[PDB]
């Protein structure tokens, strides 16, 4: 019946049966069409949509620690009566927060679930105008900043109806940097926004031609045209790298948002989907140092250190380069620091998921867990999660990927 | 029809058609049934043989610059009248070069693929005796360490025939440390090997209670029972482990063998089974320094080497095991090229097999890559191996896995 995966770092043997409620070797690609949940034209059909939202009820129900069958058979009963009547469903606020929490708990490629019961839930499910979600955004965007003191937060706008009237964020996140393609050939700012920006442009947004540029937020409201909106600069807090001990490190002139937040994603809950769900958490110190610092598709800084640290970045067998990417990670997690704003370096937030895997196996026997993304992008081995035996499925509420907004729209104008 | 894999680095796109060729996500699993090939009391079905040995012969022809349709043709029906009359089949060397080669090509682990042309085979297959395995052995591991300059090869044992009279290494390595339970409650040596150090004991083997002891062969002829050889210490060549500017590294007394040997796999070829056929190359830096020096389970030297270096060894966010990981990945580099003992580095290593999967899709439309093992231990996305999207396909020939002989073998006294 249950799949045994061990840990071979400490020996033990966990047992995982959650696998069952679930829904070539193709683990490597970045985003496969099993996680993509795609628009539609017309409802969902009943028989899909019953069997589901019945299906989320008795969960949300049987997670009470005293049971309220009294309450329960009602729920049951009145859901049953709203779909037969409208033909859809509304939750209820707290069936709603269960949903986005059950939603993180369930998402496998996420290091910091341990934290997955501490999240605020910004009904915005009344929500109807372009600069309505503006204005939702921007209050997501202050609570969650809470001036360095960051804040776990998602913002749930309405659900898809038919699948004509969809709200959707255009952008990958809520807070990213511009790329330019410069006239003397060379490219400023984040190169992997490049096409974004030039959306952004051709929408009406003003280039400003630097390295840390904030993108607007690209708003589509009930499935019209996406609107273009300046995030307001004092809600965008940064952090200006430094480093402990190389004076020289604060001359590279960089920085970074200190807000992680995923834009993009959709909700799937008791059969209902949710396609505008903006949420965030802390950063993790190797996605700023490692990802965005040092691959060579972003700001591809790693050469340049290297020489500053007068190591033989011509010869690969040196390690300069292991070196190098491991200064800038103090840099970031001690820049984080000293300006107070909340930061987890990856050797904490493995040990961190370790505990929380533990924590799901002895609570209800699993946790979905992709390998591939959760072992951080430098010192692999020397992480717990890498001896980690793990079991990736997809469970509900879940997080899921979309289409590429601008590929599947049809435009009014 | 074919499948499109993304490097994320370059932005290059490769089309895959050589998985058609091929035989919750459990790619996480160390050593998964599907890669395992175990044992048999009855030869292989003729409906299975024959088909197989056709799709050979196919193929190693086929492979040739110059077709040799006249040869090609006469072999097709000598191994049909073999199977025929004997139930079985005998490859000729050169078929055998072949597979062996060819099966290393197919080996989705292995990142040292660029040298698969390069490969000394060793025709074993004459043998009857324990104690010519060991002779066998002993030659392999003579011409493979060279004094140094290391050289790949691989010996082939008698072919399995109806499964009661299986050649076995009983070892996982060629090479490989005794780990020891003391008086006192500590573990001496490498931990990881425990079990079989005890298996080596309870055999006639004894126990020299050192940190780097290296274990006999347990050799397995004929199917009978297996029996201990210690091998001959001027065959096996150590490096001291020093660092090039902490002179207080030589005072860990640290070392390592210099011949990474795979002893324990199966070879199938064209329905044929090779149950001992252990192989070599170098090794990779991170395999010692990483993985052998820094696993918990292993010698556990991260700690040691982190306080010596007077770092923050009680602060995680320090990034002190970062630091230390290196220093020791510094020295094994180091010190194996200042004994002249081949060796590559892990950046350089995955710069090569970039360079190889290039070819294997330019030649033949495809590469069987596991990420989650060619992916090195440490520095993961400073590597293009991370941005490399990959597929993972078993092909013929291939080297599986076999079932812990221990657990399978019926002892005749
Ligand atoms: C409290 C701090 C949190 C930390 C430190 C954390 C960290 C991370 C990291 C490092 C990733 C991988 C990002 C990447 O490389 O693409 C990730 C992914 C993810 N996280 Fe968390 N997380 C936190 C909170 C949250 C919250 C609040 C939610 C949702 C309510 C969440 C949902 C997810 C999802 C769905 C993914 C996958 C995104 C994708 O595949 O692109 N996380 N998180
Ligand atoms: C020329 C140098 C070579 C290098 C540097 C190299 C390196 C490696 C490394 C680092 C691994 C992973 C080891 C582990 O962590 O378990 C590996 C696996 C493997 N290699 Fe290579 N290799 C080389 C030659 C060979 C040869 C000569 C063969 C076979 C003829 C081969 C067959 C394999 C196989 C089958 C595996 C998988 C073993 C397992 O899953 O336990 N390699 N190699
Ligand atoms: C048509 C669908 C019928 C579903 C039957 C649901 C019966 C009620 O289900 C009950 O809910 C309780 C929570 O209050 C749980 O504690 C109980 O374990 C569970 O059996
Ligand atoms: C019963 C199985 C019949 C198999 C038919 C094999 C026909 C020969 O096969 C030929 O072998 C040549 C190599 O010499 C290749 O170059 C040719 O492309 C291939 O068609
Ligand atoms: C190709 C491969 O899927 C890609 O490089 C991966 N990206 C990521 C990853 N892991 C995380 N957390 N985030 C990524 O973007 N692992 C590897
Ligand atoms: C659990 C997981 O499968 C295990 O930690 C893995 N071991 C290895 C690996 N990769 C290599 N090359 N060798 C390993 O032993 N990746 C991860």
Redesign the interface.
């Known amino acids: 019946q249950y799949?045994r995966?061990?840990n071979?770092?400490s020996?033990e043997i966990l047992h995982?049966t959650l696998?069952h409620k679930?829904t070539?070797?193709?683990?490597?690609?970045?985003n496969p069409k099993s996680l993509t949940r795609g628009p539609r034209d017309k409802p969902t059909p009943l028989e899909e949509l019953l069997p589901h939202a019945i299906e989320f009820i008795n969960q949300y129900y049987g997670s009470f620690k005293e049971a309220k069958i009294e309450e329960h058979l009602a729920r049951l009963e009145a859901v049953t009566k709203e779909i037969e009547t409208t033909g859809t469903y509304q939750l209820t606020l707290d069936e709603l927060i269960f949903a986005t929490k059950m939603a993180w708990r369930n998402a496998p490629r996420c290091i910091g679930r341990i934290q997955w019961s501490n999240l605020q839930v910004f009904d915005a499910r009344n929500c109807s105008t372009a600069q309505e979600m503006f204005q939702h955004i921007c209050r997501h965007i202050l609570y969650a900043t809470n001036n360095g003191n960051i804040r776990s937060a998602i913002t749930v706008f309405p659900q898809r109806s038919d699948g004509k009237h969809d709200f959707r964020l255009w952008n990958s996140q809520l807070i990213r940097y511009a790329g330019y393609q410069m006239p003397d050939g060379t490219i400023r700012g984040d190169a992997a926004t490049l096409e974004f920006t030039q959306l952004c442009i051709d929408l009406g947004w003003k280039p400003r031609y630097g390295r840390f540029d904030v993108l607007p937020l690209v708003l589509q409201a009930d499935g019209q045209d996406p609107e273009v909106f300046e995030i307001p600069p004092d809600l965008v807090l940064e952090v200006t790298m430094e480093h402990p001990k190389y004076e020289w490190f604060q001359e590279l002139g960089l920085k970074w948002y200190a807000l992680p937040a995923v834009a993009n994603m959709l909700l799937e809950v008791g059969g209902l989907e949710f396609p505008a769900c903006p949420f965030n958490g802390w950063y993790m110190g190797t996605e700023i140092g490692?990802?965005d610092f040092?691959?060579?598709?972003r700001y591809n800084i790693?050469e340049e250190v290297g020489r500053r640290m007068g190591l033989e970045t011509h010869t690969?067998?040196?390690?300069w380069?292991?070196?190098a990417?491991?200064e800038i990670?103090?840099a970031v997690?001690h820049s984080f620091?000293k300006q107070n704003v909340t930061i987890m370096?990856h050797?904490?937030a493995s040990?961190s998921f370790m505990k929380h895997m533990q924590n799901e196996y002895r609570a209800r026997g699993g946790c979905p867990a992709?390998?591939?993304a959760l072992?951080?992008?430098?010192?692999?081995?020397?992480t717990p999660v890498?001896?980690?035996?793990?079991?990736?499925?997809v469970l509900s509420p879940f997080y899921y990927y979309q289409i590429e907004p601008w590929k599947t729209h049809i435009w009014q104008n």
Chains 1, 2 share one sequence.
């Open positions: 799949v995966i061990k071979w770092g020996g995982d696998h679930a070539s070797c193709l683990g490597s690609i970045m490692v990802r040092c691959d060579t598709q790693l690969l067998a040196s390690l380069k292991d070196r990417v491991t990670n103090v997690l620091q370096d050797h904490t040990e992709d390998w591939i072992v951080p992008p430098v010192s692999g081995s020397i890498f001896h980690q035996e793990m079991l990736n499925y």
